[PDB]
Motif scaffolding. Structure first.
Motif, PDB file in Angstrom:
ATOM      1  N   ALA A  13      37.462  81.648 -28.268  1.00  0.00           N
ATOM      2  CA  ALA A  13      38.616  80.771 -28.276  1.00  0.00           C
ATOM      3  C   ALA A  13      39.499  81.081 -27.073  1.00  0.00           C
ATOM      4  CB  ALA A  13      39.396  80.936 -29.568  1.00  0.00           C
ATOM      5  N   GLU A  14      39.865  80.049 -26.321  1.00  0.00           N
ATOM      6  CA  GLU A  14      40.770  80.215 -25.180  1.00  0.00           C
ATOM      7  C   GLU A  14      41.942  79.244 -25.295  1.00  0.00           C
ATOM      8  OE1 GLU A  14      39.341  79.284 -21.082  1.00  0.00           O
ATOM      9  OE2 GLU A  14      40.283  81.206 -20.597  1.00  0.00           O
ATOM     10  N   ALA A  15      43.129  79.787 -25.534  1.00  0.00           N
ATOM     11  CA  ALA A  15      44.340  78.984 -25.544  1.00  0.00           C
ATOM     12  C   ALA A  15      44.658  78.545 -24.117  1.00  0.00           C
ATOM     13  CB  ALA A  15      45.501  79.771 -26.135  1.00  0.00           C
ATOM     14  N   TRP A  16      44.906  77.255 -23.926  1.00  0.00           N
ATOM     15  CA  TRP A  16      45.284  76.741 -22.614  1.00  0.00           C
ATOM     16  C   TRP A  16      46.609  77.328 -22.145  1.00  0.00           C
ATOM     17  CZ3 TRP A  16      44.043  70.943 -21.455  1.00  0.00           C
ATOM     18  CH2 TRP A  16      42.726  70.668 -21.841  1.00  0.00           C
ATOM     19  N   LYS A  17      46.760  77.492 -20.839  1.00  0.00           N
ATOM     20  CA  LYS A  17      48.060  77.850 -20.293  1.00  0.00           C
ATOM     21  C   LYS A  17      48.994  76.648 -20.431  1.00  0.00           C
ATOM     22  CE  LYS A  17      47.254  82.066 -19.416  1.00  0.00           C
ATOM     23  NZ  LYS A  17      46.239  81.924 -20.496  1.00  0.00           N
ATOM     24  N   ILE A 328      32.742  73.237 -26.505  1.00  0.00           N
ATOM     25  CA  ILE A 328      32.056  72.486 -27.559  1.00  0.00           C
ATOM     26  C   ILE A 328      33.030  71.920 -28.595  1.00  0.00           C
ATOM     27  CG2 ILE A 328      29.981  73.886 -27.249  1.00  0.00           C
ATOM     28  CD1 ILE A 328      30.625  75.133 -30.013  1.00  0.00           C
ATOM     29  N   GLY A 329      34.219  72.503 -28.674  1.00  0.00           N
ATOM     30  CA  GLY A 329      35.259  71.990 -29.548  1.00  0.00           C
ATOM     31  C   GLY A 329      36.631  72.343 -29.019  1.00  0.00           C
ATOM     32  N   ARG A 330      37.644  71.626 -29.493  1.00  0.00           N
ATOM     33  CA  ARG A 330      39.019  71.926 -29.107  1.00  0.00           C
ATOM     34  C   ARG A 330      39.978  71.637 -30.247  1.00  0.00           C
ATOM     35  NH1 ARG A 330      41.366  68.398 -24.467  1.00  0.00           N
ATOM     36  NH2 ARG A 330      39.294  68.883 -23.618  1.00  0.00           N
ATOM     37  N   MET A 331      40.766  72.647 -30.588  1.00  0.00           N
ATOM     38  CA  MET A 331      41.826  72.497 -31.571  1.00  0.00           C
ATOM     39  C   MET A 331      43.141  72.200 -30.867  1.00  0.00           C
ATOM     40  SD  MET A 331      43.380  75.359 -34.151  1.00  0.00           S
ATOM     41  CE  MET A 331      41.826  75.679 -34.970  1.00  0.00           C
ATOM     42  N   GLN A 341      49.566  73.240 -28.823  1.00  0.00           N
ATOM     43  CA  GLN A 341      48.846  74.233 -28.033  1.00  0.00           C
ATOM     44  C   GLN A 341      47.341  73.996 -28.118  1.00  0.00           C
ATOM     45  OE1 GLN A 341      49.728  77.269 -25.999  1.00  0.00           O
ATOM     46  NE2 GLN A 341      47.637  76.545 -25.617  1.00  0.00           N
ATOM     47  N   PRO A 342      46.719  73.568 -27.012  1.00  0.00           N
ATOM     48  CA  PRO A 342      45.269  73.394 -27.109  1.00  0.00           C
ATOM     49  C   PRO A 342      44.519  74.725 -27.109  1.00  0.00           C
ATOM     50  CG  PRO A 342      46.224  72.096 -25.306  1.00  0.00           C
ATOM     51  CD  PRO A 342      47.253  73.075 -25.733  1.00  0.00           C
ATOM     52  N   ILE A 343      43.459  74.786 -27.909  1.00  0.00           N
ATOM     53  CA  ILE A 343      42.573  75.940 -27.950  1.00  0.00           C
ATOM     54  C   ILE A 343      41.148  75.460 -27.740  1.00  0.00           C
ATOM     55  CG2 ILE A 343      41.872  78.005 -29.201  1.00  0.00           C
ATOM     56  CD1 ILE A 343      44.868  77.865 -28.892  1.00  0.00           C
ATOM     57  N   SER A 344      40.523  75.891 -26.652  1.00  0.00           N
ATOM     58  CA  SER A 344      39.129  75.553 -26.389  1.00  0.00           C
ATOM     59  C   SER A 344      38.210  76.556 -27.075  1.00  0.00           C
ATOM     60  CB  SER A 344      38.842  75.538 -24.878  1.00  0.00           C
ATOM     61  OG  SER A 344      39.432  74.417 -24.242  1.00  0.00           O
ATOM     62  N   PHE A 345      37.077  76.070 -27.568  1.00  0.00           N
ATOM     63  CA  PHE A 345      36.015  76.936 -28.061  1.00  0.00           C
ATOM     64  C   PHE A 345      34.821  76.772 -27.134  1.00  0.00           C
ATOM     65  CE2 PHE A 345      38.804  75.729 -31.466  1.00  0.00           C
ATOM     66  CZ  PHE A 345      39.148  76.950 -32.004  1.00  0.00           C
ATOM     67  N   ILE A 346      34.518  77.861 -26.442  1.00  0.00           N
ATOM     68  CA  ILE A 346      33.634  77.862 -25.284  1.00  0.00           C
ATOM     69  C   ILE A 346      32.477  78.820 -25.483  1.00  0.00           C
ATOM     70  CG2 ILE A 346      33.490  78.430 -22.825  1.00  0.00           C
ATOM     71  CD1 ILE A 346      36.559  77.642 -22.802  1.00  0.00           C
ATOM     72  N   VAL A 347      31.271  78.361 -25.177  1.00  0.00           N
ATOM     73  CA  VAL A 347      30.114  79.247 -25.142  1.00  0.00           C
ATOM     74  C   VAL A 347      30.095  79.987 -23.813  1.00  0.00           C
ATOM     75  CG1 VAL A 347      27.606  79.425 -25.258  1.00  0.00           C
ATOM     76  CG2 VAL A 347      28.810  77.688 -26.613  1.00  0.00           C
TER      77      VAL A 347
END
Length: 390
Positions: A13-17, A328-331, A341-347
């Motif tokens: 999970a990576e929260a966007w800046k 693959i997904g984004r919350m 706050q966007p959160i990317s889910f990245i392989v």
């Protein structure tokens, strides 16, 4: 040469800046995830006195004080919101005033856009409506769950409530199978119920969790899942948070059951039908954990962790993810009343700047596989899919 469902052992999970900031968002309690998004827009209930208002943001226009279009019409608070699976300008809201409203956004949505009149006003529910979910395969078909225990099925085109099923206790969640034929719902009596709207009958029911607090469900069929399988979250006898996988064809006991943790918030399950990723998110929790349902087995992958509670949330559609980032997904996570706050889910992959084809099977397309008329004739055409590439 279609890409098969990938095994995903690693997903971070990576929260966007960047953030959608300087918003005025509602923090009222509901029985839904709270937000909605399609490939273009974000819907977020606004912090206003009186009738419920939906803020409409463009997904692409991230940053401070973005252009917020307004959807009014509601005379009470908004309980649920969902964009159409097919039509970019169409969405539905469920309202405490018992009315489900279908909205059509203009071609160009700006900060001065105001919607007051729905294109369809669906009346008849006797108490507050808590969900409004579009059929993933059939145009014009929607299910709405009422606090009084009624699940109402609507043909929005005809403004026709063509079937209803009433349980004795309040609804807590209602979700469609990816096949588009069955609905699953949870009720306050701790039951998971399966409903066939075209037959207007309950075709299965089971006590899904033994604790008192709210159970939630979603389907886990589709491409990566298993036909007729449903996933629930709930609470054990000792009020621990737990989950179960159910086979609606062998609906007497879980296929799989496991404890999650000792949290307090009901967990909303979000299934990525294309990869098998399964996210469980609790409002008020500062973390979100996820699993992959693959080969009929559920496996823990990882978790999103922060020091800021999730107030409301939603995930974006598969068609909207950033393929070149192996997203693959984004919350979209509401923080307090002023930030999304966007959160990317990245392989994680060695080459972070080339297309990882193996991660993107054919995704649900924005085309219905069936017309309402075809569906009522008893057809079950699988959802239409599109292999997306950058």
């Amino acid at each position: 040469d279609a890409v098969d469902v990938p095994l995903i052992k690693n997903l971070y999970a990576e929260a966007w800046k960047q953030q959608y900031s300087d918003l005025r968002l509602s923090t009222k309690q509901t029985e839904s995830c709270g937000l909605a998004a399609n490939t273009e827009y974000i819907a977020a209930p606004w912090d206003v006195g009186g009738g419920g208002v939906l803020g409409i943001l463009r997904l692409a226009d991230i940053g401070r004080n973005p252009a917020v279009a307004k959807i009014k019409g509601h005379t009470a608070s908004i309980q649920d919101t969902n964009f159409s699976p097919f039509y970019r300008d169409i969405l539905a809201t469920a309202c405490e005033d018992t009315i489900v409203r279908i909205w059509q956004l203009p071609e160009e949505v700006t900060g001065t856009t105001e919607l007051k009149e729905p294109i369809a006003t669906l009346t008849g529910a006797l108490k507050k409506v808590l969900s409004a979910e579009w059929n993933p395969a059939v145009s014009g078909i929607l299910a709405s769950g009422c606090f009084d225990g009624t699940v109402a099925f609507w043909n929005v085109e005809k403004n026709e409530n063509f079937a209803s099923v009433k349980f004795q206790e309040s609804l807590l969640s209602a979700k469609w199978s990816w096949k588009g034929d069955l609905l699953a719902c949870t009720t306050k009596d701790k039951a998971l119920n399966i409903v066939d709207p075209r037959a207007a009958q309950v075709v299965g029911s089971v006590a899904c969790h033994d604790g008192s607090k709210a159970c939630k469900c979603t389907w886990i069929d589709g491409l990566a899942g298993r036909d007729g399988h449903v996933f629930t979250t709930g609470f054990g006898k000792m009020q621990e948070r737990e989950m179960a996988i159910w086979d609606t064809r062998k609906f007497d006991k879980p296929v799989y059951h496991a404890e999650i943790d000792r949290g307090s918030s009901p967990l909303y399950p979000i299934f990525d039908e294309t990869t098998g990723m399964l996210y469980v998110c609790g409002k008020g929790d500062s973390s979100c954990r996820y699993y992959q349902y693959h080969g009929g087995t559920l496996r823990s992958v990882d978790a999103y962790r922060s020091s800021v509670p999730i107030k409301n949330f939603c995930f974006i559609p598969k068609l909207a993810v950033d393929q070149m980032r192996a997203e693959i997904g984004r919350m979209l996570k509401q923080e307090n009343g002023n930030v999304l706050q966007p959160i990317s889910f990245i392989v994680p992959r060695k080459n972070q700047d080339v297309f990882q084809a193996d991660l993107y099977p054919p995704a649900p397309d924005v085309e219905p596989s069936m017309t309402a008329e075809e569906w009522f004739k008893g057809e079950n055409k699988a959802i239409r899919r599109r292999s997306v590439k950058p």
